[PDB]
Scaffold this motif. Structure first.
Motif, mmCIF file in Angstrom:
data_model
loop_
_atom_site.group_PDB
_atom_site.id
_atom_site.type_symbol
_atom_site.label_atom_id
_atom_site.label_comp_id
_atom_site.label_asym_id
_atom_site.label_seq_id
_atom_site.Cartn_x
_atom_site.Cartn_y
_atom_site.Cartn_z
ATOM 1 N N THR A 84 4.360 20.097 -107.686
ATOM 2 C CA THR A 84 4.237 19.071 -106.629
ATOM 3 C C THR A 84 3.807 17.767 -107.289
ATOM 4 O O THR A 84 4.430 16.752 -107.006
ATOM 5 N N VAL A 85 2.851 17.811 -108.211
ATOM 6 C CA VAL A 85 2.281 16.584 -108.848
ATOM 7 C C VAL A 85 3.325 15.888 -109.723
ATOM 8 O O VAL A 85 3.173 14.662 -109.945
ATOM 9 N N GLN A 86 4.270 16.636 -110.300
ATOM 10 C CA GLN A 86 5.375 16.042 -111.104
ATOM 11 C C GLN A 86 6.208 15.166 -110.157
ATOM 12 O O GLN A 86 6.273 13.955 -110.366
ATOM 13 N N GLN A 87 6.733 15.794 -109.104
ATOM 14 C CA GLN A 87 7.470 15.125 -108.009
ATOM 15 C C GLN A 87 6.692 13.862 -107.627
ATOM 16 O O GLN A 87 7.297 12.785 -107.628
ATOM 17 N N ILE A 88 5.378 13.969 -107.391
ATOM 18 C CA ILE A 88 4.537 12.839 -106.885
ATOM 19 C C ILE A 88 4.522 11.708 -107.910
ATOM 20 O O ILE A 88 4.507 10.509 -107.508
ATOM 21 N N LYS A 89 4.499 12.036 -109.197
ATOM 22 C CA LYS A 89 4.429 10.982 -110.243
ATOM 23 C C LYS A 89 5.697 10.122 -110.167
ATOM 24 O O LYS A 89 5.605 8.925 -110.375
ATOM 25 N N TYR A 90 6.860 10.740 -109.960
ATOM 26 C CA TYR A 90 8.156 10.016 -109.838
ATOM 27 C C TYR A 90 8.092 9.118 -108.603
ATOM 28 O O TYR A 90 8.398 7.899 -108.744
ATOM 29 N N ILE A 91 7.665 9.682 -107.461
ATOM 30 C CA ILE A 91 7.549 8.930 -106.178
ATOM 31 C C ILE A 91 6.638 7.724 -106.402
ATOM 32 O O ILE A 91 7.021 6.621 -106.001
ATOM 33 N N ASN A 92 5.521 7.907 -107.105
ATOM 34 C CA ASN A 92 4.490 6.858 -107.285
ATOM 35 C C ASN A 92 5.024 5.794 -108.269
ATOM 36 O O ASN A 92 4.724 4.572 -108.083
ATOM 37 N N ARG A 93 5.823 6.170 -109.264
ATOM 38 C CA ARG A 93 6.469 5.142 -110.124
ATOM 39 C C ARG A 93 7.364 4.244 -109.240
ATOM 40 O O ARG A 93 7.296 2.988 -109.346
ATOM 41 N N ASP A 94 8.132 4.855 -108.336
ATOM 42 C CA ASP A 94 9.056 4.140 -107.407
ATOM 43 C C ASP A 94 8.246 3.169 -106.576
ATOM 44 O O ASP A 94 8.629 2.000 -106.524
ATOM 45 N N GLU A 95 7.146 3.643 -105.991
ATOM 46 C CA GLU A 95 6.321 2.880 -105.027
ATOM 47 C C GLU A 95 5.693 1.652 -105.690
ATOM 48 O O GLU A 95 5.523 0.649 -104.977
ATOM 49 N N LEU A 96 5.384 1.692 -106.984
ATOM 50 C CA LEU A 96 4.854 0.500 -107.706
ATOM 51 C C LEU A 96 5.966 -0.556 -107.815
ATOM 52 O O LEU A 96 5.674 -1.730 -107.556
ATOM 53 N N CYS A 97 7.214 -0.175 -108.097
ATOM 54 C CA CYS A 97 8.378 -1.114 -108.084
ATOM 55 C C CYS A 97 8.560 -1.711 -106.678
ATOM 56 O O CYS A 97 8.845 -2.919 -106.570
#
Ligand SMILES: [Fe+2]
Ligand SMILES: [Fe+2]
Ligand SMILES: [Fe+2]
Ligand SMILES: [Fe+2]
Lengths: 321, 321
Positions: free
Chosen positions: A211-224
């Protein structure tokens, strides 16, 4: 001040990229991408669309289903459900609202960046469906998608986020545009971040690290996504200063404070000091630290001038890919 | 029959995926992707969004700039300019119009697929800017983007494609929705295909094969786009038969015939029998073959019953990746 939606082709449009505006420009609506007025918009398109491309189903979900089944406290499961339920709601609202922004923006490179953003929000929606299909049983996954039907705190967050967007949809004027834009920035700035901190907590004790791997990708997107609307708001301030009336500038500081307040009351309802590594005090300073960070980045004074350092400074290195 | 744009969150929405509709459904507008009513929509999302992902700037553009500079006939350069100018216009119109469709669709999986499609149209826009930056000089690339300003045949194609979309935008009723939808399907079915055939001609004689690489990716995307609207139209026929009045069903066969006619008159204006491997007769049977293929796939009789085989049958193997 009623923002018209540009017609599909305008033969009387400006040829001169230098004459583009974020809103109320006079474009042909041909994407003349040989000349870019907003280099940040085109750089952010390439970053979201190509550089940061990712496939949720290529992240292995081998362990989390067991850790959920046996290793997670009854409190950890409650948080997991609430956080994922609310992030599903957020990303749903965003996929839909970004179509409203894109159809109002008159600069092609910014429309391009918004399209890429809309696409990343769809990928997030795919990621959550993949997380649940992998991690939990079918009736439970349905329940998490539908958890607003059982939890009035979650239902009320949702209706509130929708309220700010629906004013612009129903009444598409310049005022309601700026407030929707500010609402988007607040939602991407703040409303993911109780959720992200909680997952990175579970994950620093080696729980739900898939779940935390998935979240890291989502959170990289959200900073952009945060960077993109930071630029839109700051460019809108230069290009349309009439729109940042003192009434508006005041409201921006009210909502940003409210929003920081609510994200904390959610952070605390979710966790309830029952989660090893995070307490109600740490939450308060994370969201207040994020609030100042984001309201200053769009040309305002800190709203929590007491807070100056980031309580969870360890997240910056953990969340890296 | 005025299609409302759904509000951002509907707490009185149906929980039951089985109750979704393409239009006029009663969704929550939460993307409840644990249950899929339209498996084709979700399969097409995964195909466009993940499987067929591609980066235009990772296609090498080493040769085409020279072949343009010295090896291309004055007729080949004219075609190149006209075709690329018009495809830039098409993909621009699509990025913008697909936001209009997505915001009217009430089935989340179909909105997901439309979002992926919008994103692929943005990638095409990136591809054309990359093709021109690589292949031609800066004033020439500006001229190609702007060639509608010099060529009344191209200007008139553009205004015509915009006309069908603007009726729905200005007057967002059920009739104008079906006609826009049919217009989208026609544009993706037909209006790329003089253009694609011409590039695959240049390319079968080893001219502009870098441009042709880019084109093969674009054409793979466009077949998924055609499939998606094929399904939307055929599902719309089942779900909303009131909307396919006999007036509408007649108009569908008029426009499809007109559209086949015009794509041929463009195919011929572009080429003018001056392009080794393609003539005005081959064009006519390609577009008429495509017309029957696509109007029958949406529940109609052939419109050119004389034509039954594909004149350019070699393209199916050439265009493969
Ligand atoms: Fe997201
Ligand atoms: Fe986002
Ligand atoms: Fe395209
Ligand atoms: Fe397309």
């Amino acid at each position: 001040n009623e923002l018209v939606r540009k017609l599909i082709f305008n033969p009387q449009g400006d040829r001169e990229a230098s004459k583009r505006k974020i809103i109320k420009g006079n474009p042909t609506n041909i994407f003349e991408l040989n000349e870019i007025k907003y280099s940040w918009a085109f750089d952010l398109y390439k970053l979201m669309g190509f550089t940061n491309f990712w496939i949720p189903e290529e992240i292995q979900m081998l362990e989390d289903r067991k850790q959920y089944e046996t290793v997670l406290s009854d409190y950890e499961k409650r948080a997991y459900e609430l956080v994922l339920s609310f992030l599903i709601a957020l990303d749903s609202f965003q996929v839909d609202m970004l179509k409203e922004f894109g159809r109002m923006i008159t600069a092609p490179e910014v429309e391009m960046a918004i399209t890429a953003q809309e696409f990343q929000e769809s990928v997030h929606a795919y990621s959550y469906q993949f997380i649940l299909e992998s991690v939990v049983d079918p009736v439970k996954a349905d329940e998490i998608y539908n958890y607003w039907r059982e939890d009035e705190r979650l239902l009320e967050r949702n209706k509130v986020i929708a309220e700010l967007y629906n004013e612009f949809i129903r009444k598409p004027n310049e005022e309601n545009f700026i407030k929707a834009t500010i609402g988007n920035y607040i939602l991407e700035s703040l409303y993911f971040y109780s959720g992200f901190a909680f997952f990175y907590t579970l994950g620093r004790q080696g729980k739900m690290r898939n779940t935390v791997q998935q979240i890291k990708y989502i959170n990289r997107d959200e900073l952009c996504h945060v960077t993109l609307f930071r630029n839109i708001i700051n460019t809108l301030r230069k290009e349309n200063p009439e729109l940042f009336t003192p009434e508006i500038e005041k409201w921006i500081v009210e909502y940003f404070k409210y929003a920081v307040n609510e994200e904390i009351k959610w952070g605390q309802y979710v966790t309830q000091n029952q989660i090893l590594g995070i307490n109600d005090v740490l939450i308060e300073r994370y969201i207040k630290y994020l609030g100042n960070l984001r309201i200053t980045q769009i040309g305002f004074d800190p709203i929590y001038p007491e807070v100056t350092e980031n309580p969870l400074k360890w997240i910056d290195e953990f969340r890296k890919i």
